[PDB]
Write a structure and sequence with these properties.
Keywords: Acetylation, Cytoplasm, Deafness, Disease variant, Hydrolase, Nucleus, Phosphoprotein, Protein phosphatase, Repeat, SH2 domain. This is Tyrosine-protein phosphatase non-receptor type 11. The protein is of the alpha+beta class. It has 13 helices and 24 strands. The protein has helices spanning 10-19, 71-80, 116-126, 187-196, 223-231, 238-246, 257-260, 262-265, 316-325, 404-418, 435-453, 461-469, 479-497; strands spanning 25-30, 38-44, 47-55, 60-62, 67-68, 97-98, 110-113, 131-136, 144-150, 163-171, 176-177, 199-200, 206-207, 211-212, 218-219, 293-296, 305-308, 330-333, 348-351, 354-363, 367-376, 379-391, 426-429, 458-459. The radius of gyration is 25 Å and the shape is globular.
Length: 498
Amino acid sequence: RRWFHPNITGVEAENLLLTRGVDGSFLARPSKSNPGDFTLSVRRNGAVTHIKIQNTGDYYDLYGGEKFATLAELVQYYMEHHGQLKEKNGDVIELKYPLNCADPTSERWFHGHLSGKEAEKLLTEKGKHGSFLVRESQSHPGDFVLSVRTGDDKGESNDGKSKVTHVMIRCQELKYDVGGGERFDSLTDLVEHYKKNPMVETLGTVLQLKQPLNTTRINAAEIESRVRELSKLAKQGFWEEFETLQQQECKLLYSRKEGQRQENKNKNRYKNILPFDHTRVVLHDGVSDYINANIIMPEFETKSYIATQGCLQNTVNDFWRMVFQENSRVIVMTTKKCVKYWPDEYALKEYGVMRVRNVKESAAHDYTLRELKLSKVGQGNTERTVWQYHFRTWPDHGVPSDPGGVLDFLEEVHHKQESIMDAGPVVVHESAGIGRTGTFIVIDILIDIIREKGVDCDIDVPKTIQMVRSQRSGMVQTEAQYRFIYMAVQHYIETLQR
């Protein structure tokens, strides 16, 4: 995600595009004037056009234009649909040349000010073979040091099989080098070069750069201290941790061809917010196999969920086909177009081949529970109860002021799910199925870890979000939702400690 400049003004962006760019050069940056917003700056006809992009709780909104799940999917869309981006007057804005950012402060491997001893401590405790970081030098101001661990062990050791090597990086006229050879435009360029071609020591050791040092995993028992640091005002804040996570989104541009098919286009609440092909729910009840929904598996590729959009008039029947096929017994939803897909209390309705009875509704302060009976018409023996949890106290703007409501809600949802043997994935849906949906699911994943293992366990919020985002685009949308996840997990741990 080199075209994203985290710490530049609009004036700086214009000057950068006018001096180092040409017509078609572009970059993105966070809005300094409206928290959360972003600006896409594009050079056209020797001038710079600015395009406002709102990151709401539900999606990214190119103002006056279309919705997207992430900034990276937005840029990818227009980099491959040249001529689809136009002003209201109709004039085209072409995205041709990403203007690369040199700033490394948002990269997972960049630690800024850090002593050589501390770096060795961190790499010793948390590192394994190929763990690395880049730190400012204290012995050569302005220079940097790449510290990398190599060996066969993992963690603290005394067999000498593992070591930390410190590679000095000179900064000479805004260019970076390791003392010879190529001079790189940025630390990121240097780092990417040695990821592909690791440096070999004179005696043969290959300094493989396999993964950045993890700095975000914490012990759940120490959640308060991390939160207090992230909450400070004057930097290792929620903003910085979230920005670093966002910087990884170009690794999540998985294919979404099925959702792009013409016969499926009108089954999407937003035409550009689509399910990844490799995790989408495939309907095989035959027809049409498509629904805009993804399976979300915890510990993906190392309880499950279906993350999906609110139903459309023309997808209500598909929604119930999915619920039936997947043996889902619990639905989590919010409401704020997406259509009502259940009958009123005591009524029975058919949705295509599926029949649904609303047996009983129960009102709580934070949510309404609907006990639904689902069956396939002509086959009364297929009946099963689907418990629909309609969360009611999520504010129209931002996140709940106290996570207690969500937590008690998810606790009840968890117990309902756990009481039904062999129940399928919990279905979570609202709006586009990524914002609140991802927030609910990530909270539930993290809480479930603490359920099994207790307060003395490791949790990693951004790594968990990245893992969920590899299964559906843009899960967890905003820094407010990110902070809310931490607040919810903190509240949950404190509840258990007391």
